[PDB]
Design a protein around this ligand. Structure first.
Ligand SMILES: COC1=C(OC)C(=O)C(C/C=C(\C)CC/C=C(\C)CC/C=C(\C)CC/C=C(/C)CC/C=C(\C)CC/C=C(\C)CC/C=C(\C)CC/C=C(/C)CCC=C(C)C)=C(C)C1=O
Ligand SMILES: CCCCCCCCCCCCCCCCCC(=O)OC[C@H](COP(=O)([O-])OCC[N+](C)(C)C)OC(=O)CCCCCCCCCCCCCCCCC
Ligand SMILES: CCCCCCCCCCCCCCCCCC(=O)OC[C@H](COP(=O)(O)OCCN)OC(=O)CCCCCCCCCCCCCCCCC
Ligand SMILES: CCCCCCCCCCCCCCCCCC(=O)OC[C@H](COP(=O)(O)OCCN)OC(=O)CCCCCCCCCCCCCCCCC
Ligand SMILES: NC(=O)C1=CN([C@@H]2O[C@H](COP(=O)(O)OP(=O)(O)OC[C@H]3O[C@@H](n4cnc5c(N)ncnc54)[C@H](OP(=O)(O)O)[C@@H]3O)[C@@H](O)[C@H]2O)C=CC1
Ligand SMILES: COC1=C(OC)C(=O)C(CC=C(C)C)=C(C)C1=O
Ligand code: SF4
Ligand code: SF4
Ligand code: SF4
Ligand SMILES: [Zn+2]
Lengths: 83, 198, 317, 156, 339, 173, 43, 28, 385
């Protein structure tokens, strides 16, 4: 159901709660949204990742897209960068 | 950097000796902090005498009692540190006189010297448990009527031991031992690295 | 017919009584920079009917109080107020009580029982104090209230309210006797426990002693009573001191004029309430046993001598 | 003529009367009255909406528990609540009274007023904005509108 | 199941998810109280308006109580209520069979469908409640019907604990308040002058704890416990005693039950919750069965509580301005007639 | 510099005094003031139709934002939990399969929350923000407790205005 | 980058003093109009 | 505002000072 | 001697005060105020919280005066660190310090009247209050309970445009104070219920620790803002409104006069507020700007440590008192080297004032007690703490 698949179960004593009232779950789960994000190709060995917008992003980090074997992923945006 | 005026540091220091000489008997330590404040420390027996001299001395009139409080250092044999902060509208100055009292060794009351203390002394008894002899009417002020335990003592649990809810069966509010639904998360915050004292 | 003439003279007043609360909760509002109640109904016209229905539906709490007296006081209150409107001399008054003013004075006095008994019956400390305070102020203001009327009558010639329409065919009795009008107006403010003199239900000082325990239907009946009175006493000011024009050919003009003056003086005690803080209990009584009663006694003499030395004794018809 | 219809209409009238005039009660405990007093004040007139702030438990309906319900005041709240007229609704106002608020873990604060009085609308915010209280009072009005007391009588 | 963790008070878990259909009423107020105190998950089906159900909300921790909209003439509503409960307690009952629900429905018809579904659901235990001395051939249609049902409930949920309680007295009690409420009638009409009417009263709390305990106790299965009381009484002392604590005069007046059944009919006629009813009258003048062998309150752990002990609280509201300050021990407790 | 607020018999003086005392003048003066306002435009607003103005920094109701791509901003550093004065925010986290760091459970107890706005301050990625909405009064206490899904949903609903508000005030911060 | 500051040249001046106006009809004049009213009324 | 020039004059006469200069309605 | 509990829920009694009273006739023989109906633990809770997360408690201590209270803790924490705020921040604190004084006096004067029975002054000035709140909101984000004045300066510079509006308002507010005077200052009736009620001698006022308008009303000249200047209240020029024949009416006049004098201080602050920064530049005490923490490593480390752990104030203890609108508000903040305080007794102008209720309301009627609770501006938050 939800992000980490919370599933109050058919036998749980808590699934009682939703009776006559819906559960809060999310469409466009994020888990798949960045996976849906194209790999940002770059020329330089290392690249930055302000998160986009500077102050309105994440603390800037420099990712080493040095091995095509792996597309660097800024630990903050989950954006893969293709050397 | 704060705008320290050495002019003060000196004048207050000089008064600190003045008082120390005037009442050699009860003053144990006197120091003018770098924050430009004097904190005469007196033996508990000097509560009445030291205050009275400050309330009624031409060269040191300290008419109003700003506050009476009791820090509790559990390590210290004398647990409580009654602190009396006083003001002098005449000399535009202040001084703090602090004494030490243990749980069952009461301090004298100064309601005579300043009637402001009538309430604060009741506040110190209710929260910390120090007792004040010769107090007109010492009785809990801030805590509930049936409260058991002195709350601001460092050895008292924050949440306490009793909480109240309304029970239908008995149609009346009823204490029950505290049961909390998210305990106070006790974040440890002290850093293992000190700061080289200036 | 006479029955129809009882519906009119009652309902009409009750409907108007309801619209006074509304014109109180809006005139006080605009004076205090606020619209007042306009959201229920159009411009708040349905607002008085709305809380009436809430009040009657909510439980009539019977505290664990002398029931009979507790319930009677409200009844007396409303009974008296509606009754005092019977002999009013709007043209062709419902009932020409020859000694009408006396009747008005009498019923007005009986009202005190309600507040007194209510407090005693309520059995609450707040209520008790309210009653004691109320009875004292009420009766005292009655003593100057009565003397002020006796001065009037002696210049009217009779106790019948109908005579004043013939006394005031050339000039209002305010011009003469204005000094008492003011003293009738202030006494009318005390006897309706309105603001400047509202220590009966100060709310802030003591919390509504009169109806501390009264809620729902009992609250409403006194409630209704007070407001009807608020009008009646203002209306008595508009007959005794401000004499509306009257023409035998056209008797309506009087009613219309009576309307305008009654509404304005009814508006005035609304305006007084928002404008003034409340007098203390001691201060209130001092004003009447001390500031006024000596004024009211003396002028009584002046109004006894006036006719004689002016050979202006009035006809007794 | 079906009484069922006759009943619904009647109920509605009853609901309109109550919802229209909700004389709130004087209950400021922890500086949220300041906000409430703002509602009563001119920008956001409570009166227009019917609210009149009566000050006697007996003739007041809604009890806006604005503020922290300390342990010492707990019984009192219950008393005043019990002494209000029959149809009584409680509007908890403030994080200090919805739950415990900044003082939830304290030894002298009841963690919520809904542990001492049943609560109908919970208005959130440390100083819940006056507009928010007004929103909360308006939601009590929609709660009352939906209540169908006589139809349940009829169908019972 | 739900492993029981906690210290035992509110905000703790006991693992009893329990539908309790008649929570809205007198005893329910008590059944939900203990269940909530213990920390059990309580689903309270309701058809009364939300304003009335509010008193229930205050009892139990955040999330312990869940309220579901339910109609007796709809089987589906009972179905979803017991979906996730493991204990079902049935307290559905009335004294005035109403226009659209007659004694069979409130006692036998409905309480059957309920336990029936409960089984389909797989609830561990069902606790039906029927009146004590509900002989299948008793005088009151009610008692007859209640017995009829207990027969049926045993078919649907075999061994669903059944509890037959004796007259129940507690604030808002009928047994104790009703008599005190005969004050309007200057004299008190009592068949056989209030004698020939032995009855044993049981405090509402006593009955409850038992019921709750029944859910958490293994022995209860397939039992017909009958919560009775700590002392029996001829209706005479009871009536006077009541009037005694109420401090109101007593004039016990003999009136034929024949004519009186008619008085019950009169009130029964009234549309709004008849103050009294043909049946209630019969039930009143119906003596209570002997101890027999059925287990009791103390068997379920709750030692019965004598009537005189808490009577003061139930009858206090009926006193006057001064009588409101008298206490039970200066007062004289009435004699106990076991007969 | 000090000032004396209330430091302070000719026939005319006496007579005028009597004029005031017996003609109640100072009382009539007060009535004039209230009559004056009766004529002023009252300041009230139709509450549902017109709303009292709140500028961008208004703290209002908590929301968790997401990156434009769709990846929730929070990376569970959990210092929003650390600086919460009321202990309101409860966060427990575990590495999502992606390998990234995300919060399994983020629960703001709004009844515990005193809307200080420090969480808005503390977040490095600025994932938790004080959203503009103040109207979230709820019938039941449980609704006020908010898990990650309600806050993320709150974030999605008000993201457009939250973005505008943060846009207006970020230079100041 | 701009900082909210007093406008150039400073703001204008505000009133910090009560401007309550001592306006009234003089007492003698006040009494005379009233006594004249009663005299006319009596006549 | 929207005094109409007659309600304003009753306002000014009753108050005894010019409210027009210091209004209760804040404007741009 | 009839005993009666004024009652927690009294329309007049501010907040909740159980004033057990023994009334001979209507006269009040004895006045034993009960307190703690709003004790909440503010002093113990602070020991378990870091300096910056205890700042929001101070706004709640006496919330009529939301910010002025925050300045007292600020000053206290700044002294212990021997850091002082930047010049612009100081003026701000005096700007919002004064705006807050007005807010308190509008509360005290108008709420006083509502209990007396005058209700129109409250609505007149609550509209002005409202307008002020909006300043708070557009500066802090919250109408009240801002958290704007932090231990090292204010949190964020004023919005671009606030000063102009704090002018329009100030330019007019005077007339609004003027209007109220008309109704009360000289009402033939306000005077009576207020004049010669609760007279407090000068020697007795100092003795019972009144320290506020209550002292100033008795003619003692003491404004901690002139005697011991804090922030830049030294660079402004204002006149303390001293009083004579101290009584409810005189002190009132004093509170209306400080409303007037605060407009004089606000004007100046708008006329002379300096260009500059609004928080100390020591990332050690003040949190780093968000552009900096998102581009510079030392700033992130300083942001992370400051928010998660804290200031780490040097060990010491200080009693710093300002002139909060009610009176002397002081924080005695004992501090170990730790980031969380050890003790923080809040001196509440109000614990002393209530105590005086007994020595003020003697041989007085029930209505007199209502007037005197008003002339002490008792906010039960500060007294109960
Ligand atoms: C300042 O705030 C307040 C007001 O609003 C401005 C008041 O006017 C008042 C005056 C009284 C109130 C509390 C509200 C006024 C009451 C009403 C709307 C009407 C009362 C209802 C009744 C007794 C009966 C109404 C029904 C009928 C007349 C039906 C007749 C056929 C006070 C005291 C107040 O607190
Ligand atoms: C009710 C109608 C009268 C009050 C109207 C108040 C609103 C209009 C504005 C009035 C105003 O601004 O005057 C302030 C002024 C303020 O007066 P003052 O306080 O400056 O004192 C003036 C007198 N000296 C200076 C000598 C002390 O009020 C007056 O005009 C003086 C009081 C006049 C009182 C006359 C009472 C006559 C009663 C006749 C009743 C007739 C009923 C029909
Ligand atoms: C309840 C108590 C208050 C009731 C309302 C107030 C009643 C006040 C009555 C005053 C006395 C009647 C009166 O003054 O005039 C009556 C009138 C005769 O007066 P007069 O103008 O001389 O007429 C003769 C020439 N045409 O013509 C009459 O004589 C009419 C007959 C006498 C009517 C007197 C009032 C009757 C009241 C009836 C209700 C009484 C309720 C008593 C309740 C207590 C328990 C018994
Ligand atoms: C020569 C022949 C004989 C005739 C001689 C005539 C001589 C000239 C007239 C002299 C008397 C004129 C005034 C009469 C009424 C006032 C009487 C009086 O003395 O006032 C008492 C009191 C003020 O007293 P105080 O201020 O406490 O000080 C007392 C000092 N001894 O008053 C008060 O405090 C009143 C408080 C009122 C509160 C509400 C005020 C409402 C104001 C607006 C309404 C005013 C009345 C409107 C009337 C309309 C028509 C009915
Ligand atoms: N104290 C007593 O008089 C005794 C009672 N009992 C049994 O104990 C049980 C509880 O007693 P008590 O609480 O006093 O009874 P009540 O009259 O208070 O009603 C009990 C519950 O049953 C519900 N109920 C009644 N009729 C219906 C219906 N037609 N449809 C749905 N629900 C209904 C009521 O809800 P609502 O009112 O909302 O419909 C109420 O919550 C009863 O069933 C009774 O048989 C046994 C011996 C003595
Ligand atoms: C007029 O007197 C007053 C009351 O009595 C009706 C109140 O209930 C209340 C309480 C009402 C609110 C909205 C706080 C106040 C403030 C008041 O001044
Ligand atoms: S909630 Fe915030 S505002 Fe309301 S009382 Fe508790 S603290 Fe004061
Ligand atoms: S601070 Fe921002 S990022 Fe770190 S946890 Fe709280 S929300 Fe997620
Ligand atoms: S607002 Fe203040 S309290 Fe509410 S969560 Fe964010 S930090 Fe914790
Ligand atoms: Zn990134």
């Amino acid at each position: 159901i939800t992000h980490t698949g919370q599933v109050y179960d058919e036998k749980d004593y808590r699934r009682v709660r939703f009776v006559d009232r819906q559960k809060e779950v999310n469409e466009n789960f994020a888990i798949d949204l960045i996976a849906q994000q194209p790999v940002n190709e770059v020329e330089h060995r290392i690249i930055a990742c302000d998160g986009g917008g500077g102050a309105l992003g994440h603390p800037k980090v420099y990712i080493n897209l040095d091995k095509e074997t792996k597309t660097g992923t800024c630990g903050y945006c989950g954006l893969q960068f293709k050397q | 950097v704060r705008p320290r005026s050495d002019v003060t540091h000196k004048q207050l220091s000089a008064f600190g000796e003045y008082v120390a000489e005037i009442l050699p008997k009860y003053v144990q330590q006197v120091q003018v902090s770098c924050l430009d404040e004097l904190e005469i420390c007196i033996h508990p027996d000097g509560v009445i005498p030291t205050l009275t001299f400050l309330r009624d001395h031409t060269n040191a009139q300290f008419k109003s009692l700003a506050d009476l409080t009791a820090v509790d250092v559990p390590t210290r044999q004398n647990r409580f540190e009654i602190v009396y902060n006083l003001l002098s509208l005449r000399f535009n100055s202040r001084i703090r006189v602090k004494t030490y009292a243990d749980e069952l060794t009461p301090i004298d009351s100064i309601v005579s010297v300043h009637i402001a203390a009538n309430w604060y002394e009741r506040e110190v008894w209710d929260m910390f448990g120090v007792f004040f002899f010769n107090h007109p009417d010492l009785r809990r002020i801030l805590t509930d009527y049936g409260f058991e335990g002195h709350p601001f003592r460092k050895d008292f649990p924050l949440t306490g031991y009793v909480e109240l809810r309304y029970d239908d069966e008995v149609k009346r509010v009823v204490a029950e031992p505290v049961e909390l639904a998210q305990e106070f998360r006790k974040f440890d915050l002290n850093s293992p690295w000190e700061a080289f004292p200036a | 017919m006479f029955f129809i003439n009882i519906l009119t003279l009652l309902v009409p007043i009750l409907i108007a009584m309801a619209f006074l609360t509304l014109v109180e909760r809006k005139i006080l509002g605009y004076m205090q920079l606020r619209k007042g109640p306009n959201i229920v109904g159009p411009y708040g016209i349905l607002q008085p009917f709305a809380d009436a229905m809430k009040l009657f539906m909510k439980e009539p709490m019977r505290p664990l109080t002398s029931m009979s007296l507790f319930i009677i006081a409200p009844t007396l209150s409303l009974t008296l107020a509606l009754s005092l409107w019977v002999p009013l001399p709007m043209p062709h008054p419902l009932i020409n009580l020859n000694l009408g003013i006396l009747f008005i004075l009498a019923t007005s006095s009986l009202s005190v029982y309600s507040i007194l008994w209510s407090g005693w019956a309520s059995n609450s400390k707040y209520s008790l104090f309210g009653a004691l305070r109320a009875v004292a102020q009420t009766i005292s203001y009655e003593v100057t209230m009565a003397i002020i009327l006796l001065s009037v009558l002696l210049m009217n010639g009779s106790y019948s309210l109908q005579t004043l329409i013939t006394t005031q065919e050339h000039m209002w009795l305010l011009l003469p006797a204005w000094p008492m009008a003011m003293m009738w107006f202030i006494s009318t403010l005390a006897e309706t426990n309105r603001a400047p003199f509202d220590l009966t239900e100060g709310e802030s000082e003591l919390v509504s002693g009169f109806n501390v325990e009264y809620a729902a239907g009992p609250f409403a009946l006194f409630f209704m009573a007070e407001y009807t009175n608020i009008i009646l006493m203002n209306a008595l000011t508009t007959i005794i001191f401000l004499g509306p024009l009257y023409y035998i050919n056209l008797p309506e003009l009087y009613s219309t004029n009576f309307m305008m003056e009654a509404l304005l003086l009814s508006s005035t005690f609304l305006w007084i309430r928002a404008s003034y803080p409340r007098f203390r209990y001691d201060q209130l009584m001092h004003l009447l046993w001390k500031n006024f009663l000596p004024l009211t006694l003396a002028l009584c003499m002046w109004h006894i001598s006036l006719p004689i030395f002016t050979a202006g004794v009035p006809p007794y018809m | 003529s079906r009484a069922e219809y006759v009943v619904t209409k009647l109920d509605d009238l009853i609901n309109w009367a109550r919802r229209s005039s909700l004389w709130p009660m004087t209950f400021g405990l922890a500086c949220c009255a300041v906000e409430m007093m703002h509602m009563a004040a001119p920008r956001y007139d409570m009166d227009r909406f019917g609210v009149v702030f009566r000050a006697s438990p007996r003739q007041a309906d809604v009890m806006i528990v604005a503020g922290t319900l300390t342990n010492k005041m707990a019984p009192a709240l219950r008393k005043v609540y019990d002494q209000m007229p029959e149809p009584r609704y409680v509007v908890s106002m403030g994080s200090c009274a919805n739950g415990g608020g900044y003082y939830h873990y304290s030894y002298s604060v009841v963690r919520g007023c809904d542990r001492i009085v049943p609560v109908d609308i919970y208005v959130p915010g440390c100083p819940p904005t006056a507009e928010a209280l007004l929103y909360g009072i308006l939601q009590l009005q929609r709660k009352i509108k939906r209540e169908q007391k006589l139809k349940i009588w009829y169908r019972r | 199941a739900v492993i029981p963790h906690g210290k035992g008070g509110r905000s703790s878990v006991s693992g009893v998810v329990a539908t309790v259909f008649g929570a809205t009423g007198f005893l329910g107020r008590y059944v939900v109280n203990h269940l909530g105190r213990m920390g059990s998950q309580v689903i309270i089906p309701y058809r009364c308006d939300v304003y009335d159900i509010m008193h229930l909300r205050l009892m139990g921790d955040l999330g312990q109580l869940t309220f579901l909209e339910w109609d007796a003439r709809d089987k589906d509503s009972i179905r979803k209520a017991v979906q996730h409960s493991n204990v079902v307690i049935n307290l559905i009952g009335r004294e005035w069979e109403t226009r659209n629900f007659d004694f069979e429905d409130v006692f036998v018809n409905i309480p059957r469908a309920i336990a029936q579904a409960s089984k389909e659901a797989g609830v561990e235990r069902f606790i039906h409640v029927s009146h004590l001395n509900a002989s299948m051939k008793s005088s009151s249609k009610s008692l007859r019907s209640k017995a009829v049902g207990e027969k049926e409930v045993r078919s649907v949920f075999p061994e669903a604990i059944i509890i037959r309680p004796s007259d129940i007295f507690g604030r808002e009690d009928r047994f104790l308040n009703h008599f005190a409420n005969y004050r309007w009638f200057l004299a008190v009409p009592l068949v056989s002058l209030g004698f020939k009417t032995v009855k044993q009263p049981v405090y509402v709390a006593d009955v409850s704890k038992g019921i709750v305990n029944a859910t958490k106790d293994p022995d209860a299965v397939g039992k017909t416990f009958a919560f009775t009381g700590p002392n029996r009484y001829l209706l005479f002392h009871l009536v006077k005693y009541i009037f005694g604590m109420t401090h109101r005069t007593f004039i016990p007046y003999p009136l034929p039950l024949f004519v009186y059944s008619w008085i019950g009919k009169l009130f029964g006629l009234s549309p709004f919750e008849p103050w009294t009813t043909k049946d209630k009258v019969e039930r009143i003048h119906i003596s209570d069965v002997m101890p027999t062998d059925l287990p009791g309150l103390e068997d379920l752990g709750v030692q019965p509580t004598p009537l005189e002990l808490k009577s003061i609280e139930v009858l206090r509201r009926h006193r006057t301005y001064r009588w409101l300050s008298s206490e039970i021990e200066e007062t004289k407790p009435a004699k106990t007639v076991n007969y | 510099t000090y000032k004396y607020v209330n430091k302070k018999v000719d026939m005319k003086s006496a007579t005028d005094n009597a004029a005031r005392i017996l003609m109640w003048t100072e009382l009539i003066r007060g009535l004039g003031m209230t009559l004056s306002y009766l004529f002023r435009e009252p300041a009230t607003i139709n509450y549902p139709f017109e709303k009292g103005p709140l500028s961008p920094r208004f703290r209002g109701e908590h929301a968790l934002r997401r990156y434009p791509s769709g990846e929730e901003r929070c990376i569970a550093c959990k210092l929003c939990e650390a600086i919460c004065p009321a202990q309101a925010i409860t966060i427990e986290a575990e590495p999502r399969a992606d390998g990234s760091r995300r919060t399994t459970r983020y629960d703001i107890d709004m009844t515990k929350c005193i809307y200080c706005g420090f969480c808005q301050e503390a977040c490095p990625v600025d994932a938790i923000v004080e959203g503009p909405n103040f109207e979230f009064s709820t019938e039941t206490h449980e609704e006020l407790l908010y898990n990650k899904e309600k806050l993320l949903n709150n974030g999605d609903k008000w993201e457009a205005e939250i973005a505008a508000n943060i846009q207006a005030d970020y230079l100041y911060r | 980058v701009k900082q909210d500051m007093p406008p150039p040249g400073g703001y204008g001046p505000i009133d910090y003093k009560r401007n309550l106006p001592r306006r009234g009809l003089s007492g003698y004049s006040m009494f005379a109009v009233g006594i004249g009213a009663l005299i006319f009324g009596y006549w | 505002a929207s005094a109409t020039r007659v309600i304003q004059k009753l306002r000014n006469w009753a108050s005894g000072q010019d409210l027009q200069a210091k209004l209760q309605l804040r404007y741009q | 001697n009839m005993t009666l509990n004024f009652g927690p829920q009294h329309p007049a009694a501010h907040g909740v005060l159980r004033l057990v009273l023994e009334l001979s006739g209507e006269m009040v023989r004895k006045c034993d105020p009960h307190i703690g109906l709003l004790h909440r633990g503010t002093e113990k809770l602070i020991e378990y919280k870091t300096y910056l997360q205890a700042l929001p408690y101070f706004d709640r201590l006496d919330y009529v005066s939301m910010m002025c209270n925050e300045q007292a803790y600020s000053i206290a924490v700044e002294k212990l660190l021997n850091i002082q705020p930047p010049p612009r921040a100081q003026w701000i604190r005096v700007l919002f310090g004064e705006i807050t004084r007005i807010l308190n006096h509008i509360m005290a004067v108008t709420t006083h009247a509502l209990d007396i029975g005058a209700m129109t002054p409250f609505f007149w000035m609550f509209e002005e209050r409202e307008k002020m709140f909006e300043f708070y909101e557009r500066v802090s984000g919250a109408r009240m309970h801002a958290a704007y004045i932090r231990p090292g300066g204010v949190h964020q510079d004023l919005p671009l445009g606030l000063l102009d509006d704090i002018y329009e308002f100030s330019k007019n507010f005077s007339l609004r104070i003027d209007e109220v005077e008309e109704m009360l200052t000289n009402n033939r009736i306000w005077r009576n219920r207020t004049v010669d009620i609760g007279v407090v001698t000068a020697e007795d006022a100092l003795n019972y620790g009144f320290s506020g308008v209550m002292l100033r009303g008795s003619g003692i000249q003491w404004d901690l803002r002139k005697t011991q200047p804090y922030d830049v209240y030294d660079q402004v020029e204002f006149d303390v409104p001293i009083g004579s024949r101290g009584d409810c009416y005189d002190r009132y006049l004093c509170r209306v006069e400080e409303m007037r004098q605060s407009l004089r201080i606000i004007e100046q602050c708008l006329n002379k507020m300096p260009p500059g920064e609004i928080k100390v530049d020591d990332a050690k005490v003040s949190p780093p700007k968000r552009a900096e923490m998102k581009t510079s490593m030392e700033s992130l480390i300083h942001h992370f440590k400051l928010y998660t752990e804290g200031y780490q104030v040097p060990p010491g203890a200080t009693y710093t008192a300002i002139e909060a609108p009610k009176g002397e508000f002081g924080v005695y903040l004992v501090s170990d080297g730790s980031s969380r305080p050890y003790r923080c007794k809040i001196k509440a102008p109000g614990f002393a004032h209530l105590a005086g209720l007994d020595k003020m309301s003697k041989g007085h009627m029930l209505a007199d007690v209502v007037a005197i609770i008003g002339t002490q501006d008792i906010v039960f938050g500060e007294i109960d703490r």
